[PDB]
Structure formats: structure tokens, C-alpha cells
């Protein structure tokens, strides 16, 4: 079996070919107007007929359809609210969606679609939603592991989910007693996401609450190195390790796919300084669901 | 009730011995084969892969579309083999008529 949490798990309630019609209630920009790429964090309702968990994630079906007539395929985006939701009624869903804008080979402007038709959607509007999707990222039973939270930008979602539970709610059948360490790397603070209540959570309870930023751009940390998600995690590397051949301490991964190199790097380096290589070590975690990844 | 899979990645070609009862992702995640994958629910196309010499059980398709199960395309983290499989994997779409 499993020691994430697996008892109220469902996925697949609804598919891509007959989607929740939910509908838009918030949708606000969550960047600063001077921030490199906009993330928008958005609010749609579900009328609990989506019982997701935290760590899972919904599919969204945006409208239209693309240079050829045909319908858009399904999008996936990690929940970013809890169980209950940012309403505390278990009829919402929340969503933290970076708007994709690059320019191509060409000079052409381009914008993704999805998470452009997300960025643009007004209250009241409808959205087709699919899922619960996923059983990766769930959260361990034991509420008094340790529990390392690896994010880069919108990488932080599933993670923002985790924590509403873990300090800003209160359940008669869990009660986080461990500790809970966040690492959320991001270019600028203008892009920093849900820092005040990162901040407040970290005053709820500081005795099982850690988290820290790594602001690439306007932080160094030794020989001027920029101050990556990964290099963050450079400065407590030993405390790190000491914690990664526990039975409870259960690592997450999430965001930016490529966030993840660095952090292998910095793992193989000391890992093949004491045990066997990082990767086949790794090996040994994901066999009891203590490194689960879902980066993209 | 286990079949021999192999995987033409754009790194070599992998000869792996994927069972029945086991997805394929999973078996390159303890042979220590790297490869992509996200939600690995299947619904996304982070692990693509266009399939070739055999057969494989896929049913959980959720974003497997109308003519994604014949042009032979196979999403390797929600697949069982039910025949030895020859599968080209890292594969990806992103236009074509699009
Ligand atoms: C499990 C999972 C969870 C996810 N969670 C989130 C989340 O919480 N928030 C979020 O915002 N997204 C998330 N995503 C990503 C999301 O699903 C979309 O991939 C993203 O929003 C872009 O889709 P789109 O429809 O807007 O654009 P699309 O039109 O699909 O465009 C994407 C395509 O644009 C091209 N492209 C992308 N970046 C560049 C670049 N820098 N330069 C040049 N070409 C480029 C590529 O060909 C790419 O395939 C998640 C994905 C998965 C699998
Ligand atoms: S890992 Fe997402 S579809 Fe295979």
C-alpha cells in the first residue's frame, strides 16, 4: 500500500468528455504590475461536487477551439486551495495559473492558450473542469512526519494546499504536529505567491513551520551565486541530509520542470560523499513515498 | 505475466522486461531508466511515446483522444503491456493541422 493518505481519495468524477461546468467567483492577479510573467490566482465553484484532495489537481477545458476546428485538449493545473477552500464551505476549488506569453522564432508575439483563457476569465463566466486528478502528490498519514516542500513558481500550489490545512484549519482527525519546511524559488519578490500567509502561518505555529524563499535575482549567497531554490537549500544542506534517512520525513516536489537538476545536483555531491549515488538512493525513498515529484 | 519492452530513447535504446500487472513508467523508475512524467494519472502528454512492435492496456486513457489509440501513441505511465512492446518514447505533438 501507501503511507500518503489514500482513505478520502477519489479521481476521475469527471473526465474530458463530459466536464464540471463550474463557474468563475474571484480571479485576481497575485504579481506585482513589475513582475516578469503575471500569475493570477482564481476561485471557481464546485457545489462539493468535486471532493479533491490536497496534492491532486483539476483539468481545465478552455473554450473555443484551436487552427483547426477542433476542440482544445484538457490543461492541467494543481489545485492551490485545501480540501475546503479559501470559502472554508468544501464548494470551491482554487487555482494559481502563470499566463504563458513568449515570443517565437519569427517575432510573433504568442500566448498559451489555456492559461491565457484562465488569466482572462471574468466572474460569472463558465469554466469546464475535470478530475480530481493524481495520487502522487497526496499528503503522507502521519501528521507528525517532516515534510520538505520543493516549489517553483506556480510550483507552490499543491503546497499552499498542503499548509491551509496543516495551520489555518482545524480538524477533528488531523492535527499537524511535525514539521513542515517550504523552499519557493522565484526570480523576483514582485513574484513571490501567498507570502503574507506564509507569513502568518509562520507565527500560528513557528515551532512546526519553516519556510524559505529564494528570490534568484535579488539574492547571492557565497561566491555571488544567484540564490536558486536549490542554492537556498545549499546553506542547510547538512541539516538537510540528516533528515533524508528518516521514516518520516517526506520530501515534494513541484513547479518549473528543471528546478529539478539543480537539486539532484546538489543531493549527488553529497550523497556520494557518504552512502551510495544520489539516484539510486532516491530509489529507496520513492519505495516508501518519501520523494514524490510532479514537475512540467 | 512479464514481457519484454523496448525503449527507443533519444539516448540509446533501453531493453528493459516490463511484467503484465505494472505500468511501464513505473518499471523505468526501478531499472533506473529517467524518464518524463507529471501527473502520472494520464492525463497529460508529459509522457508521450509512439508505440510500435506489440500491444499494451491503456484503458485509464483520460487524455488518450479518438485516433491518439490508433496512430499507435501511448501514454507510458498508465499502460500495462500485454505483448512484448517496442515503444518510442520521449515523443511529442504540439502541431500537425493544428
Ligand atoms: C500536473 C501538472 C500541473 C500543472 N500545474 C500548473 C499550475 O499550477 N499553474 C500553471 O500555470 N500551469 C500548470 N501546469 C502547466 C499547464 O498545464 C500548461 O502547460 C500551461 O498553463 C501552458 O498551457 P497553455 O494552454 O496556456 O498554453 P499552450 O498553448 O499549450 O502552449 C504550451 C506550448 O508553448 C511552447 N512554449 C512554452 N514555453 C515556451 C517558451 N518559454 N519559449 C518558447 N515556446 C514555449 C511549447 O511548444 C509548449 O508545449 C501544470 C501541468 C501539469 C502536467
Ligand atoms: S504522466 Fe501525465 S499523462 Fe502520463
Not at chain 1, 122 to 150: F, W
Not at chain 1, 219 to 245: D, F, P, S, V
Not at chain 2, 31 to 44: K, M, N, Q, T, V
Request: hydrophobic content about 35%; proline content about 4%.
Amino acid at each position: 500500500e501507501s503511507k500518503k493518505q489514500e482513505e478520502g481519495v477519489v479521481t476521475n468524477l469527471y473526465k474530458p468528455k463530459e466536464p464540471y461546468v463550474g463557474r468563475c467567483l474571484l480571479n485576481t492577479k497575485i504579481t506585482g504590475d513589475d513582475a516578469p510573467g503575471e500569475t493570477w490566482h482564481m476561485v471557481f465553484s464546485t457545489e462539493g461536487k468535486i471532493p479533491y484532495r490536497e496534492g491532486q489537481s483539476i483539468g481545465v477545458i478552455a473554450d473555443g477551439v484551436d487552427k483547426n476546428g477542433k476542440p482544445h485538449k484538457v490543461r492541467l493545473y494543481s489545485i492551490a486551495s485545501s480540501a475546503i477552500g479559501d470559502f472554508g464551505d468544501s464548494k470551491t476549488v482554487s487555482l494559481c495559473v502563470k499566463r504563458l506569453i513568449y515570443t517565437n522564432d519569427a517575432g510573433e508575439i504568442v500566448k498559451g492558450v489555456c492559461s491565457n483563457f484562465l488569466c482572462d476569465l471574468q466572474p460569472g463566466d463558465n469554466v469546464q473542469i475535470t478530475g480530481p486528478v493524481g495520487k502522487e502528490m497526496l499528503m503522507p498519514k502521519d501528521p507528525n512526519a517532516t515534510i520538505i516542500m520543493l516549489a517553483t513558481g506556480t510550483g507552490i500550489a499543491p503546497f499552499r494546499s498542503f499548509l491551509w490545512k496543516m495551520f489555518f484549519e482545524k480538524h477533528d482527525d488531523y492535527k499537524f504536529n511535525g514539521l513542515g519546511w517550504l523552499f519557493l524559488g522565484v526570480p523576483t519578490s514582485s513574484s513571490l505567491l501567498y507570502k503574507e500567509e506564509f507569513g502568518k502561518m509562520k507565527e500560528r505555529a513557528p515551532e512546526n513551520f519553516r519556510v524559505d524563499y529564494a528570490v534568484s535575482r535579488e539574492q547571492t549567497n557565497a561566491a555571488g551565486e544567484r540564490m536558486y531554490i536549490q542554492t537556498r537549500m545549499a546553506e542547510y544542506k547538512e541539516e538537510l541530509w540528516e533528515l533524508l534517512k528518516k521514516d518520516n520525513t517526506y520530501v515534494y516536489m513541484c513547479g518549473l520542470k528543471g528546478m529539478e537538476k539543480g537539486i539532484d545536483d546538489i543531493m549527488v555531491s553529497l550523497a556520494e560523499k557518504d552512502g551510495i549515488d544520489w539516484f539510486d538512493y532516491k530509489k529507496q525513498l520513492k519505495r516508501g513515498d518519501q520523494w514524490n515529484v510532479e514537475v512540467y | 505475466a512479464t514481457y519484454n519492452v523496448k525503449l527507443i530513447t533519444p539516448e540509446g535504446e533501453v531493453e528493459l522486461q516490463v511484467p503484465d500487472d505494472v505500468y511501464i513508467l513505473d518499471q523505468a523508475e526501478e531499472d533506473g531508466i529517467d524518464l518524463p512524467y507529471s501527473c502520472r494519472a494520464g492525463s497529460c502528454s508529459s509522457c508521450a511515446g509512439k508505440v510500435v512492435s506489440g500491444s499494451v492496456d491503456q484503458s485509464d486513457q483520460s487524455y488518450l483522444d479518438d485516433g491518439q489509440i490508433a496512430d499507435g501513441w501511448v501514454l507510458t505511465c498508465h499502460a500495462y503491456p500485454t505483448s512484448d512492446v517496442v515503444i518510442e518514447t520521449h515523443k511529442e505533438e504540439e502541431l500537425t493541422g493544428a
